[PDB]
Write a protein that binds this DNA or RNA. Structure first.
Ligand SMILES: [Mg+2]
Ligand SMILES: [Mg+2]
Ligand SMILES: [Mg+2]
Ligand SMILES: [Mg+2]
Ligand SMILES: [Mg+2]
Ligand SMILES: [Mg+2]
Ligand SMILES: [Mg+2]
Ligand SMILES: [Mg+2]
Lengths: 65, 149, 235, 161
RNA sequence: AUGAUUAGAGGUUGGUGUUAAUAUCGACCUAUUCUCACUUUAAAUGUGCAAACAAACCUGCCUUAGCC
RNA sequence: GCGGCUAUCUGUUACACGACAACGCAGGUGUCCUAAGGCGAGCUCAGUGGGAACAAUCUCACGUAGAACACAAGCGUAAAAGCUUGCUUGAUUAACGAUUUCCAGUACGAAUCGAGACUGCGAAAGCAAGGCCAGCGAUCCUUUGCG
RNA sequence: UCGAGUACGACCAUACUUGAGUGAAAACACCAUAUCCCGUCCGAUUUGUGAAGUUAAGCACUCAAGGCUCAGUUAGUACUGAGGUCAGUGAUGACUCGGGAACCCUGAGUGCCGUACUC
């Protein structure tokens, strides 16, 4: 006995939770490789840069302090 | 529950409109999509290779993926007590670049360019005027109303 | 007609109902992978007509197909014999005449050496300026002026990809570097077999020297690489 | 007046013999010199089969002749039948033709090893400007409102005859 | 319109009751007709989205994947 | 209880997103194709309106699909996706990566977007990992391949 | 030499298709030919190759009808969301608070623009 009655009011008790925003689980994975294989190598460099930018900081913040 | 195929109950939904059939546009082939813009997933027939399921027809959503000839679109789907960000894979012809933001794309384009004109800009050209207020209105034709039979 | 037919009649695409464009070939040429976001795709749409020929490099734009650097065979006669307009070699003539001025319009001076001036059996393309060939509705019978302009372009710095499977020198095995190099420059025995003996029978392409007609083009080839502008004298 | 004149496009003499075999064993050969262009066949879809022909079977030994070589071979459809048939054969568009049960009625010879076939020199006149109604590129209409008609037919029917 | 559903006004195609002259009902031919499922971006009610501190700018990185 | 259908497919039910039931209605399925697959080119179908020794077919008109598309039905397609021909095996391996539908967001089945080869058909852009979407099967066991 | 002319097009009938009119330069167009690649059973189609020629078709320009597009109605009509301890009849009917058609008919007009060249 199919009814669908009380179901729309069950889905709205604890609320129909809104979707997660885009900054949640934005895993550009399973997508088109030639993009993510480039958006990978550019992440490696931008991490060598993030590590390098902190290296001068501390060393500038040492001598210049 | 005899039939629930991938294309069920969709006679009028995928049917082309009246006197507009045949091949897809050259605009729809010359569109330009990025990862992130919005797209109306308006599944048209006459391509019949890459149409999404019925559900994702009036639906618009982010492009999370642009393969060579398939746009990947996330779409919010209110399943039962939560929405899934579905990840559909369709071809480009089933896709419009969604206007849904020209409402403030074109607003803040001239709204700021005049807020700047109003804040700093160069000058402040007067803009749209007031809408709802009073007034001693002068009539131009009197009338009455009783009946018409 | 008459009635309720032209009510539900759908008018076909405006060029198609009467005109040239083929909107199953149109939509497959200008089409490009949606990854390469607005990367320019330049065609090589060439049209042979009866009196003349028309070849211009086109990219499709949303505003309408934006032609860049059109080049005809009514401007090469301002540097050539003007005795053969639809000549297979005249196709080759405008082939590089189109191929050159694009590089002169693209500022491309490095690959502007192009290819060798002499007719080649075949060349393999990729770095250089690239385009795709649009015959339109002109067919692809082995040998055609839509294809002299092709090889005329490719031998002139264009990267219009092609195989030899449909060249006049091509036969059941490969492409004859002898059977082509003639037609690409001249095969004037078409006049020294009938039109030379035209007076030898009775009353009847005058002024033509079948001893220079071949060289009458080899003058124009090396000139194009020197005079790309080569516009017909206006005014 | 220059291009306003009519000239027969093609006289595709059609033979419609029965089912294939030794029935069409000499038809094409003695039809290889009436026009010098190889005769054709006709793969049938209906093939009523009361004559014998079935689906996709060689029955109608088609041909096709045009140009000046047909205009001259029209002087045989205008040789026999007293060079004039009934004006009730003028088509709605201006086509007409002759034909006899005697193949050897022409300069042909009813050789012994061949059955007594014939031909049907059904020709179709038409002015210049029909090469615009069918073009693989840049088509158009038939070029209506100036063409051959059942009245202009009986003009050139007995003008060039 | 895909179909209708059909009789009312009379006139190509079959059989036929007639004295090359005539109908006769079907098919048809017409102006229609009657009232229905098939038709049309044709509602109301709906529903998908977006709407302010990086969604626009003025800029500048780096690998340059794209394109010469 | 006999009778008949549980796995599935289209329309309808079904109410203009989606969802939606009934031994609820109407129909189909458990296949069939080395071409009825793939591609390129050429062509335009059902019908009709008239025409030719024989007498169908060659004639040209007008022909928005009234046909065809392996089949049920519905969408869809007209310089084709149908018709004819050509050349072919992409109906293959797929590093399978992701996704869709059923959904519990689990299989399965069928699809969609890809990647890597190796390829075929094309002058080319492109098209093809079957014939769209029904046509199918866990643990264990047997069995072959894999080295 | 100026509007348009071809060829490329984007919207896709205001653009369609009809009976004509119209074509002044060019430019398309039919046109000549099997002397070659070519594939035509065919010089039809196309595909070698050019200009005796021709506006006869084609094509764009003009009017001027179905159809199409825009509106005036149609009509606050039908229909509809909501509300009655509304009224009867279990037929929808009106009301109130709103949304609000269509077919038709009387109209309006019967394409528009965008890149190169050429004049
Ligand atoms: Mg809501
Ligand atoms: Mg089927
Ligand atoms: Mg069927
Ligand atoms: Mg396909
Ligand atoms: Mg399932
Ligand atoms: Mg699976
Ligand atoms: Mg299947
Ligand atoms: Mg396919």
């Amino acid at each position: 006995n199919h009814t669908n009655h009380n179901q729309s009011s069950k889905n709205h008790r604890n609320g129909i939770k809104g979707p997660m925003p885009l900054h949640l689980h934005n895993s550009k994975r399973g997508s088109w490789l030639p993009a993510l294989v480039n958006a990978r190598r550019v992440r490696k460099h931008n991490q060598k840069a993030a590590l390098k930018k902190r290296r001068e900081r501390i060393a500038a913040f040492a001598a210049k302090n | 529950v005899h039939s629930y195929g991938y294309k069920s109950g969709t006679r009028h939904l995928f049917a082309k409109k009246f006197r507009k059939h045949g091949a897809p546009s050259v605009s729809t082939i010359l569109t330009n999509i990025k990862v992130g813009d919005y797209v109306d997933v308006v599944a048209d027939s006459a391509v019949r290779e890459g149409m999404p399921h019925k559900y994702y027809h009036g639906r618009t959503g982010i492009v999370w993926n642009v393969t060579p000839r398939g746009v990947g679109v996330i779409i919010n789907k209110p399943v039962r007590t939560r929405t899934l960000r579905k990840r559909i894979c369709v071809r480009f012809e089933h896709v419009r670049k969604s206007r849904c933001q020209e409402a403030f794309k074109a607003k803040e384009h001239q709204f700021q360019a005049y807020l700047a004109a109003k804040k700093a800009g160069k000058a402040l050209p007067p803009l749209k005027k007031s809408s709802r207020m009073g007034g001693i209105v002068r009539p131009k034709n009197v009338e009455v109303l009783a009946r018409r039979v | 007609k008459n009635k309720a037919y032209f009510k539900r009649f759908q008018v076909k695409y405006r060029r198609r109902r009467e005109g040239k464009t083929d909107y199953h070939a149109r939509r497959q040429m200008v089409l490009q992978d949606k990854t390469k976001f607005g990367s320019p795709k330049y065609r090589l749409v060439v049209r042979i007509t009866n009196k003349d020929i028309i070849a211009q490099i086109v990219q499709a734009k949303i505003v309408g197909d934006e032609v860049v650097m059109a080049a005809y065979a009514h401007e090469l006669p301002a540097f050539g014999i003007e005795h053969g307009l639809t000549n297979y070699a005249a196709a080759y003539a405008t082939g590089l005449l189109l191929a050159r001025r694009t590089l002169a319009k693209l500022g491309i001076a490095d690959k502007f050496q192009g290819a060798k001036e002499a007719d080649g059996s075949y060349s393999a393309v990729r770095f250089p300026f690239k385009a795709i060939l649009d015959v339109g509705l002109a067919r692809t019978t082995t040998g055609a002026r839509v294809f002299g302009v092709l090889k005329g372009a490719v031998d002139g710095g264009m990267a219009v990809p092609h195989r030899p499977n449909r060249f006049p020198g091509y036969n059941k095995e490969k492409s004859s570097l002898d059977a082509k190099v003639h037609r690409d420059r001249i095969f004037g025995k078409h006049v020294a077999e009938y039109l030379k003996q035209v007076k030898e029978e009775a009353s009847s392409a005058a002024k033509v020297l079948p001893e220079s007609i071949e060289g009458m083009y080899k003058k124009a080839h090396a000139a194009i690489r020197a005079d790309p502008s080569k516009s017909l004298p206006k005014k | 007046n220059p291009m306003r004149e009519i000239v027969v496009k093609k006289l595709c003499i059609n033979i419609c013999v029965g089912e294939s075999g030794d029935r069409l064993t000499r038809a094409s050969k003695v039809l290889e010199q009436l026009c010098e262009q190889t005769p054709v066949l006709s793969r049938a879809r209906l093939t009523v089969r009361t004559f014998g022909i079935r689906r996709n079977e060689k029955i109608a030994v088609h041909c096709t002749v045009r140009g000046k070589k047909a205009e001259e071979l029209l002087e045989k459809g205008l040789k026999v039948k007293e060079f004039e048939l009934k004006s009730y054969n003028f088509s709605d568009t201006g086509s007409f033709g002759f034909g006899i049960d005697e193949h050897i009625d022409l300069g042909i010879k009813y050789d012994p090893s061949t059955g007594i076939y014939g031909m049907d020199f059904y020709v179709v006149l038409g002015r210049r400007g029909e090469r615009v109604a069918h073009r693989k590129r840049k088509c158009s209409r038939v070029g209506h409102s100036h063409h051959v008609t059942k009245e202009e037919a009986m003009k050139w029917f007995e003008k060039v005859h």
